[PDB]
C-alpha cells in the first residue's frame, strides 16, 4: 500500500560530472536555498501538504529562503518534487542596513543589493 517513501542516502551524492554540469563547488558550499513551489500540493498526501505550508510555500512561484542544513534538507527531500531549489549567491556582499531598501532578486538566483533600474 501507499506510504511515505524513504529515500536512499546514496541518491544525494553528486558526481564530478554533475559538479561540472551544475556549477556547484563541493568545497565552500552555499548556505542558502531559494525555493519556489512549482506543482500543486493538491492530489498529494497530507504530510506533503502540511510540510509545504510549514516551509511557507502556500503560494506558488513565490521564492522563499531557507538554510542549507540537514534538518531542513529533510523536509526539502520530502517535498522535492513539489518545488524548485537553487542556491543563493551574491557578489555584492550581504545587504547593509543602508541598502535594505534597494535590493532586488534575479531569475538566476542572484540577490543584488543596489537596484539602479538603469542601463549601463
Partner 1 sequence: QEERERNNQNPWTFERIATANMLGIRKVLSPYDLTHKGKYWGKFYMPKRV
Partner 2 sequence: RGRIPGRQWIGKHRRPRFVSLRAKQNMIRRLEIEAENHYWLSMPYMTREQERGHAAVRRREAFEAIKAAATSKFPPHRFIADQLDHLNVTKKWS
Partner 3 sequence: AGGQWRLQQGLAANPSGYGPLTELPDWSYADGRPAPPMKGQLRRKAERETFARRVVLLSQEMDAGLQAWQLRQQKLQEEQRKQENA
Minimum CB distance to partner 3, residue 74 (Å): 16
- Which residues, 6 or more positions from 18, have their beta carbon under 8 angstroms from its beta carbon? 24
Contact flag: residue 90 with partner 2 (CB under 8 A):
no
61 makes contact with RNA (CB under 7 A):
yes
Would residue 32 be called left, alpha or beta, if left means φ above 0 and alpha means ψ between -120 and 50 degrees? beta
Among 49, 75, 80, 86, contact with partner 1 (rule: CB under 8 A) = 80
Pick the binder of partner 2 from 41, 65, 76, 110 (CB under 8 A): 76
101 binds, among partner 3, partner 1, partner 2, none (CB under 5 to 8 A by kind): partner 3
13 binds partner 1 (CB under 8 A): no
If residue 76 lies in a helix (H) or strand (E), which one and from where to where? Answer: helix 70-78
What's the gap between Cα 49 and its chain centre? 17
Q: HSE on the CB side for 112, CA within 13 Å?
A: 10
Q: Which three cell numbers stand for residue 59?
A: 503560494
Residues within the interface to partner 1 (CB under 8 A)? 1-2, 5, 7-8, 11, 44, 48, 80-81
Amino acid at each position: 500500500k501507499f506510504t511515505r517513501s524513504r529515500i536512499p542516502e546514496k541518491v544525494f551524492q553528486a558526481s564530478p560530472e554533475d559538479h561540472e554540469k551544475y556549477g556547484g563547488d563541493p568545497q565552500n558550499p552555499h548556505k542558502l536555498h531559494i525555493v519556489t513551489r512549482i506543482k500543486s500540493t493538491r492530489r498529494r498526501p497530507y504530510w506533503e501538504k502540511d510540510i509545504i505550508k510549514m516551509l511557507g510555500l502556500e503560494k506558488a512561484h513565490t521564492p522563499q529562503v531557507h538554510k542549507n542544513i540537514p534538518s531542513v534538507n529533510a523536509k526539502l527531500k520530502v517535498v522535492k518534487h513539489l518545488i524548485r531549489i537553487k542556491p543563493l549567491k551574491l557578489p555584492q556582499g550581504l545587504p547593509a542596513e543602508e541598502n535594505m531598501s534597494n535590493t532586488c532578486l534575479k531569475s538566476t538566483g542572484e540577490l543584488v543589493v543596489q537596484w539602479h533600474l538603469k542601463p549601463v
